[PDB]
Amino acid sequence: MRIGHGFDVHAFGGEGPIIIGGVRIPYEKGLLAHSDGDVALHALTDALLGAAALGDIGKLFPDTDPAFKGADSRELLREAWRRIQAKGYTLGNVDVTIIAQAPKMLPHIPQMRVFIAEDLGCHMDDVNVKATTTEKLGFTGRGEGIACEAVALLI
Amino acid sequence: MRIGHGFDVHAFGGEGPIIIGGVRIPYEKGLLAHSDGDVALHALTDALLGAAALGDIGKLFPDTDPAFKGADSRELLREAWRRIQAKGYTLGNVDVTIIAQAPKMLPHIPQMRVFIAEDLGCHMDDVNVKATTTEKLGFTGRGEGIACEAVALLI
Amino acid sequence: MRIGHGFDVHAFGGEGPIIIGGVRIPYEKGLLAHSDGDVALHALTDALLGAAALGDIGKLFPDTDPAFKGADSRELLREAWRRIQAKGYTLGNVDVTIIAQAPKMLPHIPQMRVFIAEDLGCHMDDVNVKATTTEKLGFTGRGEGIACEAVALLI
Numbered sequence: 001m002r003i004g005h006g007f008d009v010h011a012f013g014g015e016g017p018i019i020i021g022g023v024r025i026p027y028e029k030g031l032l033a034h035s036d037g038d039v040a041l042h043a044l045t046d047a048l049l050g051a052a053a054l055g056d057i058g059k060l061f062p063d064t065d066p067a068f069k070g071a072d073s074r075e076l077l078r079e080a081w082r083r084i085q086a087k088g089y090t091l092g093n094v095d096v097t098i099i100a101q102a103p104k105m106l107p108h109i110p111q112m113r114v115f116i117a118e119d120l121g122c123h124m125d126d127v128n129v130k131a132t133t134t135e136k137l138g139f140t141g142r143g144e145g146i147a148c149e150a151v152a153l154l155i
Numbered sequence: 156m157r158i159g160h161g162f163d164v165h166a167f168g169g170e171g172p173i174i175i176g177g178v179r180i181p182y183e184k185g186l187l188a189h190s191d192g193d194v195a196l197h198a199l200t201d202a203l204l205g206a207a208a209l210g211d212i213g214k215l216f217p218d219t220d221p222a223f224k225g226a227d228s229r230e231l232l233r234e235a236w237r238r239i240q241a242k243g244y245t246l247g248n249v250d251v252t253i254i255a256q257a258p259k260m261l262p263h264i265p266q267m268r269v270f271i272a273e274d275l276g277c278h279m280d281d282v283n284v285k286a287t288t289t290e291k292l293g294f295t296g297r298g299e300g301i302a303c304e305a306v307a308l309l310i
Numbered sequence: 311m312r313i314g315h316g317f318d319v320h321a322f323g324g325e326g327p328i329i330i331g332g333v334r335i336p337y338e339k340g341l342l343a344h345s346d347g348d349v350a351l352h353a354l355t356d357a358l359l360g361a362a363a364l365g366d367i368g369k370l371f372p373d374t375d376p377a378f379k380g381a382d383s384r385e386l387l388r389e390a391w392r393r394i395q396a397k398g399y400t401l402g403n404v405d406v407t408i409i410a411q412a413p414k415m416l417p418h419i420p421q422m423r424v425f426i427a428e429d430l431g432c433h434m435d436d437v438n439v440k441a442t443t444t445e446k447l448g449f450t451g452r453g454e455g456i457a458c459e460a461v462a463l464l465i
């Protein structure tokens with residue numbers, strides 16, 4: 001059993017929607033990023049790479065490499081997962097916590113769990129996603145951006 | 156073995172004391188919330204629900220439902236725990252990290268561990284609580300609110 | 311198997327370099343602290359003490375005690391580890407996430423893993439360190455300080 005932890009942040013910028021956990025969520029503003037800025041999947045990817053001792057998302061897929069521009073975070077998720085499995089690991093379970101004042105993540109979580117479980121080739125029960133606001137405090141409370149944390153357990 | 160993670164924040168507002176980890180801690184200002192605003196127990200609850208793949212505190216006990224107004228966070232903690240156990244889980248251990256510039260949590264932690272272990276029906280040794288300031292940085296460093304993180308391991 | 315979580319923050323102040331994960335990293339400003347302000351090792355220490363139910367770094371090594379002034383965080387790391395092992399624990403694995411806009415931690419991570427694994431008497435593979443910026447948001451995004459999170463799994 002191996003434990004991992006990931007954390008990510010992306011700033012709001014431009015027009016909506018935003019992509020979180022693979023879900024296109026309607027919002028007044030979008031998120032600024034090289035890729036699709038999916039904070040939830042970056043934090044998850046890092047948690048999994050962390051538990052595998054493979055480093056982090058930026059070590060494997062550089063901000064500098066042009067191909068990663070506009071990149072689908074689920075692709076990165078699946079690749080990191082491919083490499084993790086090849087190192088001999090299997091999924092224990094993952095838990096994600098989206099820290100955002102808005103939009104409301106609640107209704108999109110079921111679909112998120114479907115995408116993530118698909119990507120990790122596991123059952124939805126091994127995947128949990130949740131959300132919380134920082135009750136108007138901070139860059140998140142001010143609507144400046146979204147953050148996300150995640151933990152993973154590999155076997 | 157299943158892993159979970161929780162995170163919560165509540166803003167200062169009104170008169171003291173504050174309730175953290177179930178402990179009434181004297182402070183110049185109190186915390187604003189629908190319930191008692193116990194940041195430590197919300198973060199813990201989410202960590203446990205997360206490890207169980209039951210979602211989050213707000214999914215089980217809505218901000219909208221009036222009964223939860225003024226609600227004792229230990230009640231929510233015990234209920235979430237009831238449901239978790241019914242899903243077949245048993246406690247491995249939990250670790251909580253209170254992020255607050257003040258007040259000093261240190262002297263109240265023993266009592267916190269007593270309440271939490273009581274609520275989870277475990278031994279104090281399976282429960283750990285700690286604290287840290289953000290050295291004057293951020294909404295926490297500015298005394299605007301308190302945050303808390305927690306991880307849990309279920310069996 | 312026992313899980314732990316740690317979190318720490320230190321403000322920039324003075325002249326560089328900074329010490330992170332035991333590595334002297336050149337930077338325009340340094341970090342303000344009683345000790346060497348190694349955010350990465352404090353967060354790690356707490357994660358390990360947390361998994362062991364030993365509390366936190368400040369419980370074991372007080373800000374008030376003068377000896378800890380200028381103190382080498384690896385010393386504290388090794389001591390906390392000594393005490394943890396004496397309580398009967400063995401390392402499962404640790405994962406660290408440095409949240410800093412700058413400097414770039416990437417090139418110093420290998421050396422960090424060497425120091426940490428040395429200190430914990432484990433193999434580098436049981437140690438992972440990663441980094442992330444908060445994309446210009448927050449006290450970290452503003453260059454006001456560095457934060458760090460860590461999780462640990464004890465056996």
Ligand SMILES: Nc1ccn([C@@H]2O[C@H](COP(=O)(O)OP(=O)(O)O)[C@@H](O)[C@H]2O)c(=O)n1
Nearest residue numbers: 058059410411412413414415416441442443
């Ligand atoms: N202080 C920092 C921050 C990030 N990094 C590295 O560079 C990348 C950070 O990029 P980022 O903070 O923009 O995160 P994303 O835009 O990939 O979501 C990370 O993936 C780390 O590998 C670093 O070495 N030092």
Ligand SMILES: Nc1ccn([C@@H]2O[C@H](COP(=O)(O)OP(=O)(O)O)[C@@H](O)[C@H]2O)c(=O)n1
Nearest residue numbers: 100101102103104105106131132133213214
């Ligand atoms: N961006 C967000 C934030 C929270 N939520 C949900 O709604 C609740 C958040 O309420 P909250 O941030 O005020 O936390 P508490 O006041 O219950 O401590 C969470 O329990 C989540 O279920 C969400 O769907 N999307």
Ligand SMILES: Nc1ccn([C@@H]2O[C@H](COP(=O)(O)OP(=O)(O)O)[C@@H](O)[C@H]2O)c(=O)n1
Nearest residue numbers: 255256257258259260261286287288368369
């Ligand atoms: N709100 C708080 C914050 C910290 N503390 C305790 O006092 C110490 C916090 O000191 P700190 O936030 O300056 O962290 P460091 O300077 O040791 O890195 C922690 O080690 C906790 O034991 C507390 O009791 N209540």
Ligand SMILES: [Zn+2]
Nearest residue numbers: 008009039042
């Ligand atoms: Zn990202």
Ligand SMILES: [Zn+2]
Nearest residue numbers: 163164194197
């Ligand atoms: Zn709360």
Ligand SMILES: [Zn+2]
Nearest residue numbers: 318319349352
């Ligand atoms: Zn520190």
